[PDB]
Amino acid sequence: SAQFDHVTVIKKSNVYFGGLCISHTVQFEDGTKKTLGVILPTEQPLTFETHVPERMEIISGECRVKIADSTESELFRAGQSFYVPGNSLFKIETDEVLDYVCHLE
Amino acid sequence: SAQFDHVTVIKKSNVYFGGLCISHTVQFEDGTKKTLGVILPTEQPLTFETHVPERMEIISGECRVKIADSTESELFRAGQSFYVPGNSLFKIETDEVLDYVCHLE
Secondary structure (H helix, E strand, C coil), X not given: CCEEEEEEEECCCEEECCCCEEEEEEECCCCCEXXXXXXXXXXXXXXXXXXXXXXXXXXXXXXXXXXXXXXXXXXXXXXXXEEECCCCEEEEECCCCEEEEEEEC | CCEEEEEEEECCCXXXXXXXXXXXXXXXXXXXXXXXXXXXXXXXXXXEECCCCEEEEEEECEEEEEECCCCCCEEEECXXXXXXXXXXXXXXXXXXXXXXXXXXX
C-alpha cells in the first residue's frame, strides 16, 4: 500500500553521499524495522554494504543496480523489489527521484 | 521526543528545489498531520509559502530564516521553533543537513 500504519518513526534522518541518499527508520508494532528513503539523481553509482540480508522495494521511480558480484546492471521500477544477500553490497544509480523501502531480512 | 509513535507515514516523498528539500507526511491517530523533512545545504535561500499557519521545529542543525516581511535573518538551532502566519512565507538557508518537523496550526 501507499502508507505504513501504526508505526514509530525516528525523527533524525540518515544522510549519505553528500545528500544523495536521505532516509528515516520506521519501527513496527512487532519490533521489526524498515528504512523509508529517497535517492536523488546520481552521476556515478552509489555503493551500499549489507550485514544482514535486505530487500529493496521501489516505491517510486526507476533505478539500475549491480547486486553483489554481478557485472551488468539490472533495471527496477516502482512496484518491483530486489534482494541483497547478507555480507554483500549493491551499487545503485538513478536519473530521477527514487523512493524506496528497505526491508530487513 | 526523538520519535513519533502510533503514526501513519505516507511512503512517497515530496521533493523540492532540485532535491534540496525532501519530506514525508505523517498522520496522527487524531487525524492531524505533520511533515517530517530534511533541508540540505543551500547556496541561496529557499522560499516556502503558507496557506494555513505553520510551526517549524528544528530537530537537528542550524538555519537562518526570514519570516513573512522581516528584513533580517533569525537564527534557529535544534530544539527551537518558529511560527509562520497563514497566507505568508519564509526563506530559509542552511550550511548543514537540517532536520525539521512542520506542524500545521
